[PDB]
Amino acid sequence: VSPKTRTSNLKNGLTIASESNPLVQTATVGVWIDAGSRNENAYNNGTAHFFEHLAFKGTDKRSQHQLELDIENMGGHLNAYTSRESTVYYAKSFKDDVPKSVEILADILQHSKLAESAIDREREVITRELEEVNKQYEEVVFDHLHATAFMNQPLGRTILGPRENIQTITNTELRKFITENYTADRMVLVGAGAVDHDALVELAEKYFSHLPSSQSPVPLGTPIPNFVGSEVRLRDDTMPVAHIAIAVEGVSWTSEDYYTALVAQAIIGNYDRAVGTSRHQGSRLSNIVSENNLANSFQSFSTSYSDTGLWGIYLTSENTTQIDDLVHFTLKEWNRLSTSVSNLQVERAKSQLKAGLLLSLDGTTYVAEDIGRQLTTLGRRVTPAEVEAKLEAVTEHDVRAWAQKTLYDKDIALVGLGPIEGLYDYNRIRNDMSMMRW
Amino acid sequence: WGGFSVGNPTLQRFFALHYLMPFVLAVFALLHLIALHTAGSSNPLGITSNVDKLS
Numbered sequence A: 001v002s003p004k005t006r007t008s009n010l011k012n013g014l015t016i017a018s019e020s021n022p023l024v025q026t027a028t029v030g031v032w033i034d035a036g037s038r039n040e041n042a043y044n045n046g047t048a049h050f051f052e053h054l055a056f057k058g059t060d061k062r063s064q065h066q067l068e069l070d071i072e073n074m075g076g077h078l079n080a081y082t083s084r085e086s087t088v089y090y091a092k093s094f095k096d097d098v099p100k101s102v103e104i105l106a107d108i109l110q111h112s113k114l115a116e117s118a119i120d121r122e123r124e125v126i127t128r129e130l131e132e133v134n135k136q137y138e139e140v141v142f143d144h145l146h147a148t149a150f151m152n153q154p155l156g157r158t159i160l161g162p163r164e165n166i167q168t169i170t171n172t173e174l175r176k177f178i179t180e181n182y183t184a185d186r187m188v189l190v191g192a193g194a195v196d197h198d199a200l201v202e203l204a205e206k207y208f209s210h211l212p213s214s215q216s217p218v219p220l221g222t223p224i225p226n227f228v229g230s231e232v233r234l235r236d237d238t239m240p241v242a243h244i245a246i247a248v249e250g251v252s253w254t255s256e257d258y259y260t261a262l263v264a265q266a267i268i269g270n271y272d273r274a275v276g277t278s279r280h281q282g283s284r285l286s287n288i289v290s291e292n293n294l295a296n297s298f299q300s301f302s303t304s305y306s307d308t309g310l311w312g313i314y315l316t317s318e319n320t321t322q323i324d325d326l327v328h329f330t331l332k333e334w335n336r337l338s339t340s341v342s343n344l345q346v347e348r349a350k351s352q353l354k355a356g357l358l359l360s361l362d363g364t365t366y367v368a369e370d371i372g373r374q375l376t377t378l379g380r381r382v383t384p385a386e387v388e389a390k391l392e393a394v395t396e397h398d399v400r401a402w403a404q405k406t407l408y409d410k411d412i413a414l415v416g417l418g419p420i421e422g423l424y425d426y427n428r429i430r431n432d433m434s435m436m437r438w
Numbered sequence B: 001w002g003g004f005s006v007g008n009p010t011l012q013r014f015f016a017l018h019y020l021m022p023f024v025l026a027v028f029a030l031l032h033l034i035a036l037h038t039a040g041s042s043n044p045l046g047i048t049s050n051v052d053k054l055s
């Protein structure tokens, strides 16, 4: 039984949330923000990611060099990432270096210079990032997947933004973005590891008290996406491995079917030929794929956003003449979530998930990430007892009913990259979303 | 004819051959398709379709 997550607020509406672990000597403090690329329009798309670069380029007090030195002297590191719906800035340090790290984070968020000289310098760095993501195939596949599934909608945009915007982002629009979005009612100060809650609340009162509040404070994790069944093919015969993602519209964080979608995802599960145990996994798709050498790997996913999600699978394969079999067998396993699953698969997946949801949190950064994610998506940290009860509530009838309305005979978004000549056209893929025998 | 003019022998043999010949025709129709399968169908532009196939 893990220690209780303590939660306090300031007057501006900044949440402070902490989970102490007296067995570790490091601490992760940081700021989770309920804001990301999805808050940009088409003209300033790329701003949030641009800011993340400039946040480390110097503040009104410390210059770029002083900032570098200050963190080096702390002993730990700082890290940041911007996603579609969430931005994070955190600092891992020693137990007693926590007040320094809170002070540095408060500085780079509130008091960053955003000097025209630095904007102009990063404008080239970010331009080079556009031509080097090209190598991270999983990311290429998932960014095309969002672009097509949410065609011409904010969730469909990339985080980097178009080349055109990178050349035209000004310090004005950067400042406007962080003034509109980085407000106290959208922010959570999180501490995990060797942190005292009462100490962290004091540090928040010292550094984050002059944060603007938004005019209309909605609750944390408050959002209309119209999924497009569609396909992107990026054939490249010179690549040896095909990367394929298939997804349907999934569930939001606060859906009533959130746990049902996780259980369904665990029934298919993951596979990787490089792991020794993977040939012995219980999943039917795992057995088909391993016995027939259809794939190097597959990874089921159920990605959630505030108002939508994507549920699907990501496959990698060198077997270029049997891509058709791989896709066929995968979608016939999805069909069985509608037609065939019983208490056998459901109770096995529940067993595996009851542990999996706890196992994931195995270090201070994972704990901080869990507190921050849950506070910015649900407005509260959900206790493991509540999670165990929501999983236990999932029956085989729930899984069948969910799959029948979410998967069965539904449109998919499909992305293929690499030697995908053997991937059939959209209709033949989408025809495997149902079974004529049922 | 089976005789010195078209008559009963001719009619009975034409019946037997008329019944048979469609089966021979079906075999040759199958042969020309198996022969075609090595190149595939041509197309109205006259170029290769190996770049862009549909089931």
Ligand code: HEM
Binding pocket: B025, B029, B032, B033, B036, B040, B041, B042, B043
């Ligand atoms: C019982 C008579 C026949 C049947 C059932 C038949 C059936 C077919 C079929 C199904 C195809 C493939 C689809 C198409 O292109 O239309 C085809 C292609 C072809 N047939 Fe026929 N056929 C017959 C008679 C003939 C005759 C009399 C010729 C030539 C004098 C011929 C020459 C061809 C050729 C060259 C092709 C390939 C055309 C291409 O796709 O570019 N067939 N036939």
